[PDB]
Design an enzyme around this catalytic site. Structure first.
Site: not given
Ligand SMILES: *[C@@](O)(c1nc2ccccc2s1)[C@H](C[C@@H]1CCNC1=O)NC(=O)[C@@H]1[C@@H]2[C@H](CN1C(=O)c1cc3c(OC)cccc3[nH]1)C2(C)C
Ligand SMILES: *[C@@](O)(c1nc2ccccc2s1)[C@H](C[C@@H]1CCNC1=O)NC(=O)[C@@H]1[C@@H]2[C@H](CN1C(=O)c1cc3c(OC)cccc3[nH]1)C2(C)C
Lengths: 306, 301
Positions: A41, A143, A145
């Site tokens: 992603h 950040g 990820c």
């Molecule tokens: C990671 O570091 C990423 N950030 C991005 C930003 C843009 C593109 C791709 C990625 S991967 C984070 C790590 C998270 C952030 C907070 N703590 C963490 O562990 N991963 C994400 O942001 C992932 C990616 C999309 C969504 N996501 C979530 O963790 C997420 C979204 C979400 C919602 O959305 C409405 C509601 C509740 C909880 C939640 N978690 C992926 C899964 C692709």
């Protein structure tokens, strides 16, 4: 003496962390030999987080659309491929710091060290267990990820986890280094929830053996139990079933302390019914389930404080 | 989200660990520039340490009495001297993996990462706090002496601890990297008791702020207190006194959550007087005191 949540020395992993940028998305990558592994992603924009078609998003990228930075050095991407939920970027330089490594997929109950990273730079190291519900209770912000989990038994780094997401409960989900998620989760922003979590019974027993090795026996009792009766009771407290495999794994700790596994199960049943009555076990007022039998043997003395 | 006990990445320190042998005694050493630092009791044989005369035992030794091993390579010892409870061994090769570093002496309540080592090889890493009674609740076995404690700040490693002993209670004691003991201890084979330990108040408050930042609010209340009233209850429960400097340090966390330091002190005062009533805070049934306000900010940001 003493007993702490002990991570592996992280140096071998620190030398593999890089920053991966595609468009306006930046996350961490793992540089092993001439390949950089990262969550697929990294190729996602704001508009394709709910239902991205990764095959369609990736075909539109060229090698020069990926910016990989190892410290202040730009690595040149010369090839790319997607494997499940992981992107593999072939680079023009093999990592001179590549340690001896392997990729392993772990089972629930297993523990590993996490090297939390931001922008390719290591922030901290901590221990975590793969919960029975396939989530981990980590400490991860925006950040993080691409940060990885690993064990380093006998100078070989076993990579078992790559970080991808945080669930609404505040727990975390990710994949093995082949890009297959642990659990039923998907790399989409769709509504997902972790199932009901249970306590890792074999780990609690291992930690009670650690307490005895370190000189504490207050919690033992004169009773024994059948494995069937122990499971009927422990499941009423949301404990995971204890199998004959778990009983066998606990053999060496039982042999070192002279406490039969089913006798330690009888102690655990009594602890669940009574609580600790103002006492602590290895500094804790709750029953700890994130130390495995192997972790106890690794950290504890091979001599019991009788 | 999430809050865990976190250690600094240890790679910069791993590249400094060596094995030091004098006779039949083997322990760990720290190799920085062309010097190896290790506990002075590496010169003691298991008989000599009931009441050692280190001045005399060192005078008897020469460079040839020391054996330093860096992985599979042997380092030649070309000088030796003692500084307090540490032995300094000058070697012929400067460590090419020496990071930017300084030797710092920490205060009680401050935390650091320990790199537990055996036979010169790093085995594990964990976080621990210097207790108000100057002990640390570490995890160390036979062969762990010479293992070091440290903090990292913008590529600079600040070394603060070198491991020397385990007390009868199972807690650990050591020195700074200049060989000065933390606490009223001596490097001798005698049972030594540490003072009655007390809880690090400012760290408990920091961890209560970390809990609020993570969604745990049940312990919050409408009440407020003053320093003098809070310190009277702190004294009663064997908590360290809270000073105006501690209130100043907690300031950022106080504004970020909307709970003043003295508003949070009223929550802690209530938890000490009434308990937790079957509830947990950040997955703990005890009030955790090994996270500094900086550990809370560093991790949550
Ligand atoms: C990671 O570091 C990423 N950030 C991005 C930003 C843009 C593109 C791709 C990625 S991967 C984070 C790590 C998270 C952030 C907070 N703590 C963490 O562990 N991963 C994400 O942001 C992932 C990616 C999309 C969504 N996501 C979530 O963790 C997420 C979204 C979400 C919602 O959305 C409405 C509601 C509740 C909880 C939640 N978690 C992926 C899964 C692709
Ligand atoms: C360390 O690795 C050393 N081992 C040796 C062996 C020979 C010479 C010098 C040294 S330093 C250990 C680490 C300890 C052991 C168990 N876990 C640890 O953290 N340090 C020691 O063994 C120190 C050194 C002498 C004795 N000692 C103790 O920890 C000690 C002695 C003692 C007694 O003695 C009667 C009673 C109760 C507790 C206790 N602990 C030094 C202090 C010089």
């Amino acid at each position: 003496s003493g007993f702490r949540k002990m991570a592996f020395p992280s140096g071998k992993v620190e030398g593999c962390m890089v920053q991966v940028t595609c468009g306006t998305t930046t996350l961490n990558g793992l540089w092993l030999d001439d390949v950089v592994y990262c969550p697929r992603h990294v190729i996602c924009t704001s508009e394709d987080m709910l239902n991205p078609n990764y095959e369609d998003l990736l075909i539109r990228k060229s090698n020069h659309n990926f910016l990989v930075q190892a410290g202040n050095v730009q690595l040149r991407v010369i090839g790319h491929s997607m494997q499940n939920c992981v992107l593999k970027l072939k680079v023009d330089t093999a990592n001179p710091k590549t340690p001896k490594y392997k990729f392993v997929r772990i089972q629930p109950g297993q523990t590993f060290s996490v090297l939390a990273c931001y922008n390719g730079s290591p922030s901290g190291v901590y221990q975590c267990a793969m919960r029975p519900n396939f989530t981990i209770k980590g400490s991860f912000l925006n950040g993080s990820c691409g940060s990885v989990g690993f064990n380093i038994d006998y100078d070989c780094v076993s990579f078992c986890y790559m970080h991808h997401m945080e669930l609404p409960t505040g727990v975390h989900a990710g994949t093995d280094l082949e890009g297959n998620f642990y659990g039923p989760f998907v790399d989409r922003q769709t509504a997902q929830a972790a199932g009901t979590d249970t306590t890792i019974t074999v780990n609690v027993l291992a930690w009670l053996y650690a307490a005895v090795i370190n000189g504490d026996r207050w919690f033992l009792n004169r009773f024994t139990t059948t494995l069937n009766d122990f499971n009927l009771v422990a499941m009423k407290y949301n404990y995971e079933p204890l199998t004959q495999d778990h009983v066998d794994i606990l053999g060496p700790l039982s042999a070192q302390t002279g406490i039969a596994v089913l006798d330690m199960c009888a102690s655990l049943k009594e602890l669940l019914q009574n609580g600790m009555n103002g006492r602590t076990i290895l500094g804790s007022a709750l029953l700890e389930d994130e130390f495995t039998p192997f972790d106890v043997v690794r950290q504890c003395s091979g001599v019991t404080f009788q």
